[PDB]
C-alpha cells in the first residue's frame, strides 16, 4: 500500500467486538484515539449491540450527534470513537451510566453504575517524563498527560483522577499483595492478588498472580493492572467477580438455572 488503511473487514475484527458474518462486508474501523485499534470498543457497536438503542448505522449517528453521549464527562460527536478501558460512558437523558470492565471471559459487558462513582477514573501510568524546565509528567494508558504529579509515582503504578478537575487524587503502589486484574492475553478479566514477580533483564518480566479461590496464573507485566489496595477493590466489580470458572461448574450452574426457571 502507498498510504494508511481506511477500511476494515468483518472477519478481521476482534472477537470481543463479537459480530456476525451474514450482515455486512466491512466492520466499523475506529478512529485514532487514546486506545489502540484492537482492545477498544467503538461507540456505534456499543449503542447498536450492547444496549439495542438503534437498529441501523444512521440512528446511532443521530443519537451520537444529538449531544446525549458523555465520554469521560465530555460529549463526543464521532461515531467510531474508541471507548477504551475504564471509560465512563454517561447518558444524561435516560440517567444511566456505564463503565467498560472485562468479565470472566474475554469480552466487554454492560455495567450500570451509580453516578457518584462516575466522578473518578482509574488509569495506569506508562513512563516518567521530565519537562523542558524540570516539570515531571505522567503518561497514563489512555494518553492523558498530567503536569506536576506526586514525587512517589513510579513507572508501573495506577492513579485515581477526577473527571472534572483532571488532577490526581490518590494512587496505589505496585506492590506484592495488592489486588490485580489482567487486561490482555489468554487470562482476561480475572481478579487476582499479586504474589510473585521475577525480573528478566532485556525481556518481559512475568509476574505470578493468585486468584481469589486459590487458583494461580502468570501473565506478562504489560498485561497487569492494579485496581485496589490489599484485597478490597476501589471499583464495583461485575457479576462473577472475575473468577474464571471452568466448563463443568458453569454447566452445573446453567442446568441449575434451567431447572429452577423451567
Amino acid at each position: 500500500a502507498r498510504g494508511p488503511k481506511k477500511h476494515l473487514k468483518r472477519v478481521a475484527a476482534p472477537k470481543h467486538w463479537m459480530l456476525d458474518k451474514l450482515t455486512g462486508v466491512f466492520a466499523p474501523r475506529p478512529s485514532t484515539g487514546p486506545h489502540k485499534l484492537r482492545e477498544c470498543l467503538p461507540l456505534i457497536i456499543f449503542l447498536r449491540n450492547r444496549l439495542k438503542y438503534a437498529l441501523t448505522g444512521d440512528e446511532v449517528k443521530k443519537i451520537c450527534m444529538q449531544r446525549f453521549i458523555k465520554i469521560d464527562g465530555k460529549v463526543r460527536t464521532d461515531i467510531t470513537y474508541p471507548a477504551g478501558f475504564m471509560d465512563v460512558i454517561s447518558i444524561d437523558k435516560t440517567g444511566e451510566n456505564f463503565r467498560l470492565i472485562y468479565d470472566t471471559k474475554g469480552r466487554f459487558a454492560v455495567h450500570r453504575i451509580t453516578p457518584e462513582e462516575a466522578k473518578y477514573k482509574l488509569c495506569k501510568v506508562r513512563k516518567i517524563f521530565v519537562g523542558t524546565k524540570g516539570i515531571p509528567h505522567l503518561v497514563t494508558h489512555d494518553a492523558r498527560t498530567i503536569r506536576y504529579p506526586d514525587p512517589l509515582i513510579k513507572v508501573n503504578d495506577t492513579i485515581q483522577i477526577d473527571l472534572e478537575t483532571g488532577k490526581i487524587t490518590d494512587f496505589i503502589k505496585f506492590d506484592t499483595g495488592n489486588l490485580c486484574m489482567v487486561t490482555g492475553g489468554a487470562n482476561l478479566g480475572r481478579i487476582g492478588v499479586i504474589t510473585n514477580r521475577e525480573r528478566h533483564p532485556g525481556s518481559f518480566d512475568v509476574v505470578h498472580v493468585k486468584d481469589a479461590n486459590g487458583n494461580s496464573f502468570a501473565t506478562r507485566l504489560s498485561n497487569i493492572f492494579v485496581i485496589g489496595k490489599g484485597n478490597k477493590p476501589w471499583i464495583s466489580l461485575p457479576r462473577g467477580k472475575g473468577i474464571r470458572l471452568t466448563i463443568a461448574e458453569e454447566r452445573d450452574k446453567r442446568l441449575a438455572a434451567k431447572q429452577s426457571s423451567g
Binding site: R10, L22, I247
Partner: protein, 185 residues
C-alpha cells in the same frame, strides 16, 4: 469480497463395494421395513452413526479423570438419551458401541406416526406426513425425517386444519358434495 457462507458438507457416503449381494439384501430389507425411499437416506444414517462411533472411540482412547473426556462424554450421552436411542440404565461411554441402525431408524417421525396408532401402514404414514397433517406441539411438520425426542413423544396429533383431526373438508369431498347438490337441486 462478498458476504456469503460457502460452508457445506456431504451427509452420506458411497460404499466401496458397488455390487455385493448381502449388503444389497440388508439395505433393501431396511428400506422395506422402515419405509425409506432410496439408499441415500440409509447411507446418511450409517454416516452419522459412524461419526458418533468414531467420536466415542476417540473419547474412550483417553484415560479417566480428564475434564475434556468427561465433559464431551457427558454431553454426547445426554444428547443421545435426549433423542431417545438410549436410557438411563445404560449410561456409560463404552455402551455407545453396541448401537445399531434400527435404533436410529426407530426414532424417525414416519415410524412413530405409524406405530403410535393413528395410521394404517408406514407408507400411508409417510403420505399423511407429507401432505401437512401431523403436527408436534402446535407446529405443522410436513417431512418424514424428523427425529423426535422423548419429551415431545406424547404430542403427536393431527393438525387443526386437517379433516382427520377436525377441520374443513378437503377438495374431493367438497366437489362431490357440490355435484350431489347440483344433481339433486
Amino acid at each position: 469480497p462478498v458476504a456469503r457462507s460457502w460452508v457445506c458438507r456431504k451427509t452420506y457416503v458411497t460404499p466401496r463395494r458397488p455390487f455385493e449381494k448381502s449388503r444389497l439384501d440388508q439395505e433393501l430389507k431396511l428400506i422395506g421395513e422402515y419405509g425409506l425411499r432410496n439408499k441415500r437416506e440409509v447411507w446418511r444414517v450409517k454416516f452419522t452413526l459412524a461419526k458418533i462411533r468414531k467420536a466415542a472411540r476417540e473419547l474412550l482412547t483417553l484415560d479417566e479423570k480428564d475434564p475434556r473426556r468427561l465433559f464431551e462424554g457427558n454431553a454426547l450421552l445426554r444428547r443421545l438419551v435426549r433423542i431417545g436411542v438410549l436410557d438411563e440404565g445404560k449410561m456409560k461411554l463404552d455402551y455407545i458401541l453396541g448401537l445399531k441402525i434400527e435404533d436410529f431408524l426407530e426414532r424417525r417421525l414416519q415410524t412413530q406416526v405409524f406405530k403410535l396408532g393413528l395410521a394404517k401402514s408406514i407408507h400411508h404414514a409417510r403420505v399423511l406426513i407429507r401432505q401437512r397433517h401431523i403436527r408436534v406441539r402446535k407446529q405443522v411438520v410436513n417431512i418424514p425425517s424428523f427425529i423426535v425426542r422423548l419429551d415431545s413423544q406424547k404430542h403427536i396429533d393431527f393438525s387443526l386444519r386437517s379433516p382427520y383431526g377436525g377441520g374443513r373438508p378437503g377438495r374431493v369431498k367438497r366437489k362431490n358434495a357440490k355435484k350431489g347438490q347440483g344433481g339433486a337441486g
